[PDB]
Amino acid sequence: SMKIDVVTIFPEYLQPVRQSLPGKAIDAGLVDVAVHDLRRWTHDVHKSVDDSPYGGGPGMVMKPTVWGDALDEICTSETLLVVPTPAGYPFTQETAWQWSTEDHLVIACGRYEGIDQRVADDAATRMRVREVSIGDYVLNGGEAAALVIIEAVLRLVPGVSLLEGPSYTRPPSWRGMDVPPVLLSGDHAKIAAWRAEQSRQRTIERRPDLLGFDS
Amino acid sequence: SMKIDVVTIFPEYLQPVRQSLPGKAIDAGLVDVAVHDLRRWTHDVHKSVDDSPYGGGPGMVMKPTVWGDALDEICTSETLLVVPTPAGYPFTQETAWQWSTEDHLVIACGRYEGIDQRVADDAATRMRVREVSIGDYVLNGGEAAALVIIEAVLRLVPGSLLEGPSYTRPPSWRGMDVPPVLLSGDHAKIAAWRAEQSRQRTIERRPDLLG
Numbered sequence: 001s002m003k004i005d006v007v008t009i010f011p012e013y014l015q016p017v018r019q020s021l022p023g024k025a026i027d028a029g030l031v032d033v034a035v036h037d038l039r040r041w042t043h044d045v046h047k048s049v050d051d052s053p054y055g056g057g058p059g060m061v062m063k064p065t066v067w068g069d070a071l072d073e074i075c076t077s078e079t080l081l082v083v084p085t086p087a088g089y090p091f092t093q094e095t096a097w098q099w100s101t102e103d104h105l106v107i108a109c110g111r112y113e114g115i116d117q118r119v120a121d122d123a124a125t126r127m128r129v130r131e132v133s134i135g136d137y138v139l140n141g142g143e144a145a146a147l148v149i150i151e152a153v154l155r156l157v158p159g160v161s162l163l164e165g166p167s168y169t170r171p172p173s174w175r176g177m178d179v180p181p182v183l184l185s186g187d188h189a190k191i192a193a194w195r196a197e198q199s200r201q202r203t204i205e206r207r208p209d210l211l212g213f214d215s
Numbered sequence: 216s217m218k219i220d221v222v223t224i225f226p227e228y229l230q231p232v233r234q235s236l237p238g239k240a241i242d243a244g245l246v247d248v249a250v251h252d253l254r255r256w257t258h259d260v261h262k263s264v265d266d267s268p269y270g271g272g273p274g275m276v277m278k279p280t281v282w283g284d285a286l287d288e289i290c291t292s293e294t295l296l297v298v299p300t301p302a303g304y305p306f307t308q309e310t311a312w313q314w315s316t317e318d319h320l321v322i323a324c325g326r327y328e329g330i331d332q333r334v335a336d337d338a339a340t341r342m343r344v345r346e347v348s349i350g351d352y353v354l355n356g357g358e359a360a361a362l363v364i365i366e367a368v369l370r371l372v373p374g375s376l377l378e379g380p381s382y383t384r385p386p387s388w389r390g391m392d393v394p395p396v397l398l399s400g401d402h403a404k405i406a407a408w409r410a411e412q413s414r415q416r417t418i419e420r421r422p423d424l425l426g
C-alpha cells in the first residue's frame with residue numbers, strides 16, 4: 001500500500017474520481033489518496049494563505065506559517081515531500097519509477113509565484129524534499145501538475161528512450177487509407193524492424209534531442 | 216471568445232470544477248468548455264472504443280471509425296485539433312501562447328498506446344492537427360495532459376533562466392531570515408541579486424537551459 005496526501009487551496013479540483021486510473025488504484029486498495037484544504041491550518045477570520053512578496057514583484061507568495069503548520073501535521077521523517085513548480089528539477093519517467101516504490105508521498109500544491117522558500121528549506125531538515133517541474137510551461141498552481149504526477153506514478157505501482165511510432169487497428173482500410181501492409185503480414189521480424197524504423201523516424205522529427213541532436 | 220471541446224471516455228474526471236482556475240474563467244465567460252463522452256459515437260451495444268493493434272503487441276489502439284465520427288461532428292475547418300501523447304512534439308510555453316488566441320480547440324484524449332494514426336492523418340487534410348507531449352513520462356491516457364494544456368493556455372487568455380526563491384512575512388521564521396537585500400529599498404541591487412539567484416538555481420536544477 002502507498003499513501004498520497006495532497007495539500008491545496010482547491011480541494012474540490014483534486015478530489016479523487018472512481019472512473020480514472022487513480023480511482024481504480026484506490027478501489028483496488030493499492031493506494032490511499034487524501035486531499036486536504038490548506039485553509040484548515042489558518043487562524044484569521046479571512047483564512048489568508050498568501051501575502052505580497054518581499055523585495056517587490058507581481059503576484060503573491062504563500063505564507064510560510066500556514067504551510068509550516070500543515071506539513072508538521074501531515075509529514076513524518078519518512079515522507080517524500082513533492083512540490084510542483086516551474087522552477088523545479090525535471091520530473092521524468094525515471095522519477096515516476098523511483099516514486100512508485102515510496103510509502104508516503106505528500107504533494108504541496110501552491111501558486112507558481114511560490115511558496116515562501118523557507119517552507120521547503122525547513123522541511124528539508126527532517127524529510128526528503130523534491131521540488132519538481134512536469135514541463136517547460138507555467139500553470140497558475142501545482143494542482144494540475146499534482147494530477148499528472150499521481151497518474152504517472154500510480155500506473156507503475158506493482159499490482160496496477162525513443163518515441164513510439166504510429167499504431168493501427170481494424171478495419172484494414174478506412175476512408176481510402178490503408179494500414180501498412182507489413183503490419184498485416186504476420187511476419188514478426190519484418191514488423192519489429194518496421195516499428196523500430198518508424199520509431200526512430202518519428203523521434204528524429206519530433207524529438208531530435210532524444211537522439212543527441214540540436215533543437 | 217474561446218471554445219474548447221474535450222473528447223474522452225472519462226468525462227467525470229475532466230468535468231470542470233468551479234473552484235479552480237478553469238472554473239473561474241468559465242464562470243467569467245472568457246471561455247466555453249464542453250466535455251464529450253467518446254462513447255456517444257460508438258457503434259455497438261458494447262460501446263467499444265478500442266481494439267487490438269495490427270502487427271500484435273500489448274495494449275489496445277483506439278478505433279478510427281469511432282474517433283472519425285466524433286471529430287466529424289465536433290470539428291470545423293477552423294478547429295485546432297490537439298492530441299496529447301507521449302510521442303508528440305513538445306508542448307511548451309511558446310505553444311501555450313500560440314494556442315491562447317485560437318477560436319476553437321478540440322482536445323482528443325486517448326490511451327497512450329494511441330489512436331489509430333489514420334484519424335490524425337485524415338483530420339489533417341481539412342484542419343490543423345497538433346500531437347503534443349507535456350513531458351517525458353507516460354500517463355495511461357491524455358486526460359491529465361488535457362487538464363495541464365487547458366491550465367497553461369487559459370491563464371494566458373486576455374481575461375531563459377529559472378525564477379529564484381520568493382519570500383513574504385514574517386521576516387524571521389523558524390530560525391530563517393528573509394535575505395536582507397530584499398528589505399534594502401535598493402531596487403537595482405535587488406534585481407541583480409535576483410538574477411544571480413536565478414543563475415545559481417538554473418545551474419543546479421536545469422543545467423540544460425544554459426548550453
Ligand SMILES: NC(=O)c1ccno1
Pocket residue numbers: 084085086112132133134135136137138139140141142143145
Ligand atoms: N511546470 C510545472 O511543473 C508547474 C507547476 C506549477 N506551475 O507550473
Ligand SMILES: NC(=O)c1ccno1
Pocket residue numbers: 299300301326327347348349350351352353354355356357358360
Ligand atoms: N507525456 C504526455 O504528454 C502523455 C500523454 C499521454 N500519456 O503521456
